[PDB]
Design a protein around this nucleic acid. Structure first.
Ligand code: NA
Ligand code: NA
Ligand SMILES: [Zn+2]
Ligand SMILES: [Zn+2]
Ligand SMILES: [Zn+2]
Ligand SMILES: [Zn+2]
Lengths: 162, 162
DNA sequence: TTGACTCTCTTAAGAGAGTCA
DNA sequence: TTGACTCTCTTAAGAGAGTCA
């Protein structure tokens, strides 16, 4: 299939196209009561999206290039990582939004990690709130906090101990 | 079933039966370098499981009772919460294992909360490591830690800023 | 070769309901 | 009435592949 040089060319064309997406400034919690700023490069809400891009689901897109008469297609956020290993610890690598903004395709807002690691960032206290992720979070996770638990642990009788 | 007395009777029979499950001691990380001990009441691996209980999936069970000559059935971990609201902020309430042990049916190890709150406990630093859950965690989440990220945010050109 | 649609699948925290004996 | 099986569905973080012009 594609040589590593051809893969680099795909990454470069992807960056050139994404770099022309609308750039949206967002103020975000960092943890520790501090606020910061992220600049997201947001794919449009409806077609046309940009050269090579098409929507396969409500918040899913793919990037497609045809090379030597063969059509190649990738998940739209996976392209920055095409020269990296695609699994770790027996788990598939996934594109993980550090900005928690699905439409964003800024490669400086993405990392490449297991789906469990990816999901867990939703609850991280953030880079100024105690983040221990080795590839550090850019912001506090949107779901961090005390939660909204309706009922806690309880028993009616005396059959149980903790 | 319908009446509050009938619901109370269901909860009481469930507690009596689960109270006879084997009690298994598990030592657990609490965060902050500390360890604690939990006593889980574990449903058997194979039939018979206990009066009223049947397995509907590899780690899914249901509890069943006949009331007014009709069968009423519930997810096996939902029974303690039958007098509670079944939603919160428009999200379905779910049984959430504070001990992260699916076979356990100890109601002192369960709470009732949105699926997002439920999931997020997998990454909590724990009651001695910074848990902020209002209904406090019993242990550090099994997935807490630095992660195993294969590649971090990166660009080849100069089109992007954080 | 390209755009704009269509479809189903993965994961791991959770669910509801039917078929037999 | 009770037990022991069978099936598919929900969610929100993520995927692969087909059709037509
Ligand atoms: Na994510
Ligand atoms: Na859980
Ligand atoms: Zn972004
Ligand atoms: Zn983090
Ligand atoms: Zn337990
Ligand atoms: Zn917690």
């Amino acid at each position: 299939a594609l040589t590593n040089a051809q893969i680099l060319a795909v990454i470069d064309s992807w960056e050139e196209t994404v770099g022309q997406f609308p750039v949206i400034t967002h103020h975000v919690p960092l943890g520790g009561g501090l606020q910061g700023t992220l600049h997201c490069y947001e794919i449009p809400l409806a077609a046309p999206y940009g050269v090579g891009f098409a929507k396969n689901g409500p918040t899913r897109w793919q990037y497609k290039r045809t090379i030597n008469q063969v059509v190649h297609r990738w998940g739209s956020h996976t392209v920055p990582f095409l020269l990296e290993p695609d699994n770790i610890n027996g788990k598939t690598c996934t594109a993980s939004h550090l900005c928690h903004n699905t439409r964003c395709h800024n490669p400086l807002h993405l990392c490449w990690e297991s789906l469990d690691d990816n999901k867990g960032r939703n609850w991280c206290p953030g880079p100024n709130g105690g983040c221990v992720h080795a590839v550090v979070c850019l912001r506090q996770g949107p779901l961090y906090g005390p939660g909204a638990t309706v009922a806690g642990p309880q028993q009616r009788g005396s059959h149980f101990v903790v």
